[PDB]
Amino acid sequence: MATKIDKEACRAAYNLVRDDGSAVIWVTFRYDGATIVPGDQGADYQHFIQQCTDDVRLFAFVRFTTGDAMSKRSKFALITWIGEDVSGLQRAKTGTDKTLVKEVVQNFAKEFVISDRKELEEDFIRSELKKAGGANYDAQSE
């Protein structure tokens, strides 16, 4: 009804992506019909490359190294993939659903959004966490 998210799957990988067993570096799901359920995956970053597609949309969740916060020695963040060739239907859905799975976050630090494959670089998401200081307030919002 309205929208159905299967965060149940991501969850299993969300916190398990921190275990020394599965190893599934990250997991991505895509709006299949009227529900959000696993669609692709990755055991390493190189996969995100054979997995990135400007013609698809999905969220990503990989554990990046922090080399600082001795906390589990590692950072946790989610990434959004907005392909530039998907229908307009799922578009309005991503907005409502991306907020659903986002509220079920309880094992990370911050989420990020992307619009290009070159933006999926590690030095890009790494320098993004080291920031952790939203100050666009003087930007009158966007």
Swiss-Prot record:
The keyword Cell cycle does not apply. GO terms for cellular component: cytoskeleton; cytosol; nucleus. SUPFAM superfamilies: Actin depolymerizing proteins. Keywords: Acetylation, Actin-binding, Chaperone, Cytoplasm, Cytoskeleton, Nucleus, Phosphoprotein. The keyword Isomerase does not apply. One of its GO terms (molecular function) is actin binding. Residues 66-75 are annotated as: Flexible and important for F-actin binding. Belongs to the actin-binding proteins ADF family. Coactosin subfamily. This is Coactosin-like protein.
